[PDB]
């Protein structure tokens, strides 16, 4: 017949390599398709839907885990104190694990693009206030006071008829992509720190509660991409199922 030769790479089974394979059933014809609403074509339009961020993840909320979604604001006695602080990278273990962006970034290794963080006020109609939300590029720890944290990319938000505000976390990096940050050598890919502060106080009249809560949402922008699919760390199988 035709003279051939066998190179290396013969009789191996590579899992991620597509090819033609022999069918079992000649002459089959599947069931015709029906128009079902809500078809996806890409994983990038699930990473744009915003989900709740667990900023208030303390060790005392492990017994009543519904407290972990809302962090409080209240009437302050001193001017310029801070309310919360957390890191701004979706791969690291922290507040971003509860989002659909933080779970789909897990399956991939490197990411790119800018994010967004949407805060929503859930107080009464008669309570007013102003708060400062700042984002700090890497190189430092949590800032010590309000006069230091305002040098970053910040926004000033007041409570009115529109209850929400949006802080974009712009893509400031040296490399084109970023692997997942981690303690050790992989702190080179850190993103920054988001802290919110008190611009003015939380003023309330007579006959209204003096503690309100804030929900924080998070999504991705248009230029968000991911690559290098891998395995995830969030599911374990110690013993067999069933």
């Amino acid at each position, epitope marked *: 017949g035709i003279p051939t030769e066998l190179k290396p790479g013969t009789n191996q089974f590579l899992t991620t390599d597509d090819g033609v394979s022999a069918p079992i059933l000649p002459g089959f014809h599947p069931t015709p398709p029906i128009h079902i609403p809500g078809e996806v074509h890409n994983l990038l339009e699930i990473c744009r839907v915003e989900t709740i961020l667990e900023v208030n993840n303390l060790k005392t909320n492990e017994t009543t885990p519904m407290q972990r979604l809302c962090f409080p604001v209240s*009437v302050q*006695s*001193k001017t310029g104190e801070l309310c919360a602080a957390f890191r701004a990278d979706p791969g690291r273990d922290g507040p971003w694990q509860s989002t659909i962006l933080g779970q789909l970034c897990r399956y991939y290794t490197q990411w790119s693009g800018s994010l967004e963080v949407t805060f929503m006020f859930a107080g009464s109609f008669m309570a007013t206030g102003k708060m400062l939300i700042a984002y700090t590029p890497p190189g430092g720890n949590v800032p010590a006071d309000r006069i230091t944290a305002m040098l970053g990319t910040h926004v000033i938000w007041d409570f009115g008829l529109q209850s929400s505000v949006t802080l974009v976390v712009p893509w400031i990096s040296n490399t084109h992509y970023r692997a997942h940050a981690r303690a050790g050598y992989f702190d080179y890919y850190t993103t920054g720190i988001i802290t919110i502060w008190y611009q003015t106080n939380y003023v309330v009249p*007579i006959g209204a509660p*003096t503690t309100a809560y804030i929900v924080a949402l998070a999504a991705a922008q248009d230029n968000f991409t991911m690559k290098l699919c891998k395995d995830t760390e969030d599911i374990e199988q110690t013993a067999n199922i069933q």
Partner: antibody, heavy 115, light 101 residues
Framework: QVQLQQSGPELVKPGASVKISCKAS????????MNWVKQRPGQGLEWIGR????????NYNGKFRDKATLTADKSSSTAYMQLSRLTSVDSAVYFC?????????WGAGTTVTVS | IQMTQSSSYLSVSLGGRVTITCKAS??????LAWYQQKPGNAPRLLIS???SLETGIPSRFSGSGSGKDYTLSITSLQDVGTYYC????????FGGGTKLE
């Protein structure tokens, strides 16, 4: 180690003035309000007012307005209080506190009598 | 806002578990302090925020208050002196006093 040190006792004529001083040492003198508390010898406490030595704004009680004047020297770390037109009601002891909140550290106390 | 501290001149006996009460008039929102004073001395602030202790104070003092009526309790006596109370919600006002035996 915060230290608040006052002056000594005074014997004053009715109708004259007096200047009590309070000296702070051991911490940053600015960025902290300084309070003055009056205690007439038989009964409880009364709040006179406060002073912010960073710029110099002062809040007073309603009754003690145009009786007391609060001033603060930022360089010498000393806050003064001057009382004017003294009468025999104002024989008391005056303290020096520091929080703007709930009066963390207190002074020793200066006894003022008038006769 | 006027603080009452309606009871003075109490009677204790050396481990008697006394409690001291005061009430405000217009809804102070748990912003009290409790101020033990000895004779011939400056007062010391035993508690801040109506629940929280400072450093160096032994943990036999404890305070609480539900809506308007606030309490201060001692467990093992001797600790004899005059006790005041002070709100900081609009302007600092003090209480009357509480002498013990």
């Amino acid at each position: 180690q915060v230290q608040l040190q006052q002056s000594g006792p005074e014997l004053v004529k009715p109708g004259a003035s007096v200047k009590i001083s309070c000296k702070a040492s051991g911490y940053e003198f600015s960025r902290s309000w300084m309070n003055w508390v009056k205690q007439r010898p038989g009964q409880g406490l009364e709040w006179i007012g406060r002073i912010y030595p960073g710029d110099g704004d002062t809040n007073y009680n309603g009754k003690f307005r145009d009786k007391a004047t609060l001033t603060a020297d930022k360089s010498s770390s000393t806050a003064y209080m001057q009382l004017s037109r003294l009468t025999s009601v104002d024989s008391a002891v005056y303290f020096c506190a520091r929080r703007r909140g709930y009066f963390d550290v207190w002074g020793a106390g200066t006894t003022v009598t008038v006769s | 806002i006027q603080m009452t501290q309606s009871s003075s001149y109490l009677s204790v006996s050396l481990g008697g578990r006394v409690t001291i009460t005061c009430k405000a008039s217009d809804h102070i929102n748990n912003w009290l302090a409790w101020y033990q004073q000895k004779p011939g001395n400056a007062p010391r602030l035993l508690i801040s925020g109506a629940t929280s202790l400072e450093t160096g104070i032994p943990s036999r003092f404890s305070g609480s208050g539900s809506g308007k009526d606030y309490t201060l309790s001692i467990t093992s006596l001797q600790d004899v002196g005059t006790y005041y109370c002070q709100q900081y919600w609009s302007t600092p006002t003090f209480g009357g006093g509480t002498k013990l035996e």
